[PDB]
Design a protein around this nucleic acid. Structure first.
Ligand SMILES: [Cl-]
Ligand SMILES: [Cl-]
Ligand SMILES: [Mg+2]
Ligand SMILES: [Mg+2]
Ligand SMILES: [Mg+2]
Ligand SMILES: [Mg+2]
Ligand SMILES: [Mg+2]
Ligand SMILES: [Mg+2]
Ligand SMILES: [Mg+2]
Ligand SMILES: [Mg+2]
Ligand SMILES: [Mg+2]
Ligand SMILES: [Mg+2]
Ligand SMILES: [Mg+2]
Ligand SMILES: [Mg+2]
Ligand SMILES: [Mg+2]
Ligand SMILES: [Mg+2]
Ligand SMILES: [Mg+2]
Ligand SMILES: [Mg+2]
Ligand SMILES: [Mg+2]
Ligand SMILES: [Mg+2]
Ligand SMILES: [Mg+2]
Ligand SMILES: [Mg+2]
Ligand code: NA
Ligand code: NA
Ligand code: NA
Ligand code: NA
Ligand code: NA
Ligand code: NA
Ligand code: NA
Ligand code: NA
Ligand code: NA
Ligand code: NA
Ligand code: NA
Ligand code: NA
Lengths: 82, 81, 56, 46, 143
RNA sequence: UGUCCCAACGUUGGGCCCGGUGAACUGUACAUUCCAGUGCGGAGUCUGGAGACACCCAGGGGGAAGCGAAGACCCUAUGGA
RNA sequence: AGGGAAACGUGAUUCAACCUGGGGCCCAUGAAAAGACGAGCAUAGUGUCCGUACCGAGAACCGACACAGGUGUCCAUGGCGGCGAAAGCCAAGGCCUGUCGGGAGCAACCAACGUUAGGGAAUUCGGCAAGUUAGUCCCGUACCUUCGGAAGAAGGGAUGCC
RNA sequence: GUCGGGUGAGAACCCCGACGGCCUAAUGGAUAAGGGUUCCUCAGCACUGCUGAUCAGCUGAGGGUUAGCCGGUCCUAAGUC
RNA sequence: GUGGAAGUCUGUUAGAGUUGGUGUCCUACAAUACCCUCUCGUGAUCUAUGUGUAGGGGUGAAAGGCCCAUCGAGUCCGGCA
RNA sequence: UAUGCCAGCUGGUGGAUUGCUCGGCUCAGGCGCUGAUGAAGGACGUGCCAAGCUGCGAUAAGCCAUGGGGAGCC
């Protein structure tokens, strides 16, 4: 477990009316890499989702502090807002 | 010559009408009037018909919802057949 | 307005219907005349020699 | 639309003709309903 | 599990739009088994099925504005959109004014202040549009 | 006032790569062509030269007198309306 | 009676429906018939036959299709807004089925489109396309005219909030 | 649309919740014509569905439309026989 | 001042129409479509349903327009090989 | 020696070919009217389960009589 700051600057590469979706993907890929786990194994608590969609699908925040934990028999990460 | 009553119409809905409203349901000849249905039914089961409602069905037959008097019991009249 | 597809939309009028006398969907309910058997127009049945080849 | 008693009878019949060849008939004949009619793809008479 | 049928029944039993019906996420299995309207009412009594609240637009900001304007503010040239006759119907205004003037004269006559001849004279002039308002009429009356 | 001088940057949907679905047009044959010539006088195929290792991706359409339509123009028919 | 978990209100304004009047117009004169009323009351009996599901449309209709086309009526009184049945935003109600997705800062090229210094129609058959102007109030308004008009001519000023 | 979750052999699109949106004379409510069982339930996925599907207007089987006082029915219109 | 006339004005009210873009499309969403622009919108107005006129005949504020994707003479079958 | 050319082999696709004929085509002999005593035609029904065809008609793949036929049939 640990607290990490995820940069969402790369969501700007995606069309603006769809940032939220892309942001949510970036968050999954980030945790997957930094916690050495498969993207399939990263579970995002709705809190994170609501944070990214707070201002609608087009106005995603540039960053997001996320608390994630790693464990189990297949390897995984459970993450939430902070 | 055609007969008025064809056979009892027995389905889940017909049961509820029988158990909860003292009504009997029949498939009758589509040329039959409510009055003819009321009479035919009384003479065949020895009961008192209080009301008859009809419907020309999408099966090509006529359906009659016959309510019996509180003196008669649909559940019993139907159990003997 | 296009005489094709766009003009096909107002066609919800019933004219030709199942005929009482011959069974064909040709009884014009507006004219009360069957275009197939002649019911409503003729006691005799509608029929013409041109409905088949001349020598047959 | 407003259907009459006779029209209702005819449509009832068309619905009935729209059933499948019973399974038992396949066994009895050692082996299709060519009169299958969909309400959308087909058109009835009248 | 598929609870769409139950959604339709619940909406009708609760007498609410289907979109406002809420099904407890932890009881999908139980609601799934709900087959009858009675089964639904039962789950309703268990709070497993509820109806969300319908919102109503707040009229708070509306009321503040309504007050300013009733006090005579927020109606300058820059706030008007319709033509003058659109903001106040001139015929309707004349009916208001002429009726007020006729009622006035009517009271002064019964009251005794005016003889049926002075009244007549003033009434005719009012209908001829000689007075801008009751006050204006009263003023003219005092010579 | 980007119509123009004279074009630039950006936005959204495509385009490009991947999973799934999945047609049509068109096809005498052969066919890597280019420059000239010749020929029914407007040739990828004949003749002489030149060039040319094969396959594949994207592109804008120069050529196949490209595809599409038994020329509406014109004349002819002891044709039609 | 019923309905509501509960309270189970009182007044007001503007008032669709509905009711009832007055005026004006016609080289235009705005159905008919069945029926009802006229013509009381009690009690009782009778009231048969046909229709009734569902869709009613960017998937239930017509258009060969689950077709961006076509297709009548009523709800025209939901809130803010404002002249408004207008825009924009939002309820109730409906929907995420105008039904293929995943990836690349996502190049060229194309469709819609924003902004472009200085110049300002030089472009072009032609200002095509785009742009400018704009609501409301006050002032003011030419030629011409069939005296109605031209006219919102033109032009000038104002506009928020507290 | 997204994140969780439900069911299932199988889930981007079947269902639940949350978050985020779309429609305001309509993408809402009631209906005429026209359609004709497309309605509801259960069981299914060879067919249909612009991908997939456990879903369905699809496939199979059952079920469903109740009237003295809503329409028809009766009257007469242009006009028809 | 009152009054409120008009084949009157403005108006994407509803509704009707269809000028430019010679845009998008042009094996289309569509055998006449989409978008923006634009005209009419109390009247010689628009519209549903019913109803009449039939092929050398209708109908036509006249374009040889229209009479079911068919018109300088509809469509079907026959004359007909 | 990839992409690939020509011919063949094994398997497929396709349904030609050959063989077969419950159907046609034509000729010939015989025969020949039905209907208000409601025909012909059509509709809708009718089966234990029955969608199509055939049959039949609320007595509904049938009822009765006589003759034939025969140990099977529905
Ligand atoms: Cl009055
Ligand atoms: Cl009705
Ligand atoms: Mg009834
Ligand atoms: Mg035509
Ligand atoms: Mg069925
Ligand atoms: Mg006035
Ligand atoms: Mg050479
Ligand atoms: Mg030629
Ligand atoms: Mg010529
Ligand atoms: Mg000639
Ligand atoms: Mg209903
Ligand atoms: Mg669709
Ligand atoms: Mg500039
Ligand atoms: Mg110039
Ligand atoms: Mg020039
Ligand atoms: Mg222009
Ligand atoms: Mg359904
Ligand atoms: Mg199911
Ligand atoms: Mg006008
Ligand atoms: Mg206008
Ligand atoms: Mg008409
Ligand atoms: Mg001409
Ligand atoms: Na039956
Ligand atoms: Na149909
Ligand atoms: Na530009
Ligand atoms: Na080329
Ligand atoms: Na309002
Ligand atoms: Na889908
Ligand atoms: Na005057
Ligand atoms: Na246009
Ligand atoms: Na002709
Ligand atoms: Na011929
Ligand atoms: Na004979
Ligand atoms: Na059968």
């Amino acid at each position: 477990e640990r607290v990490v700051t995820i940069p969402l600057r790369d969501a700007r590469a995606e069309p603006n009316h769809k940032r939220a979706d892309k942001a949510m993907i970036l968050i999954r890929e980030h945790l997957a890499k930094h916690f050495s786990v498969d993207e399939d194994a990263v579970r995002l608590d709705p809190s994170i989702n609501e944070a990214a969609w707070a201002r609608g699908r087009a106005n995603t925040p540039s960053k997001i502090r996320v608390r994630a934990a790693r464990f189990e028999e297949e390897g995984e990460a459970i993450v939430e807002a902070e | 010559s055609w007969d008025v009553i064809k056979h009892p119409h027995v389905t889940e809905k017909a049961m509820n009408d029988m158990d909860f409203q003292n009504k009997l349901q029949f498939a009758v000849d589509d040329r039959a009037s409510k009055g003819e249905v009321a009479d035919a039914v009384e003479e065949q089961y020895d009961v008192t018909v209080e009301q008859v409602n009809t419907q020309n069905t999408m099966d090509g037959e006529k359906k009659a919802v016959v309510r019996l008097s509180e003196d008669d019991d649909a559940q019993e009249v139907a159990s003997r057949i | 307005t296009g005489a094709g597809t766009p003009s096909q939309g107002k066609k919800n009028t019933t004219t030709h219907t199942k005929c009482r006398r011959c069974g064909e969907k040709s009884y014009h309910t507006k004219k009360k005349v069957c275009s197939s058997c002649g019911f409503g127009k003729s006691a005799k049945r509608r029929d013409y020699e041109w409905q088949s080849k001349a020598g047959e | 639309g407003k259907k009459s008693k006779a029209t209702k009878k005819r449509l009832a019949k068309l619905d009935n003709q729209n059933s499948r060849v019973p399974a038992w008939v396949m066994l009895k004949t050692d082996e299709r309903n060519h009169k299958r009619r969909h309400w959308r793809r087909n058109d009835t008479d009248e | 599990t598929d609870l769409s049928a139950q959604k339709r029944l619940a909406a009708d039993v609760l007498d609410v739009g289907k979109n406002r019906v809420w099904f407890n996420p932890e009881r999908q299995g139980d609601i799934a088994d709900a087959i009858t309207r009675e089964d639904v009412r039962e789950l309703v009594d268990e709070g497993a099925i509820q109806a969300k609240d319908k919102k109503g637009n707040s009229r708070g900001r509306a009321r503040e504005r309504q007050k300013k304007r009733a006090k005579g503010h927020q109606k300058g040239a820059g706030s008007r959109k319709g033509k003058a006759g659109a903001r106040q119907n001139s015929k309707e205004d004349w009916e208001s004014r002429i009726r007020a003037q006729r009622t006035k004269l009517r009271e002064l006559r019964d009251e005794g202040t005016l003889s049926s001849s002075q009244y007549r004279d003033l009434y005719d002039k009012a209908g001829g549009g000689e007075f801008d308002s009751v006050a204006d009429l009263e003023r003219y009356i005092d010579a």
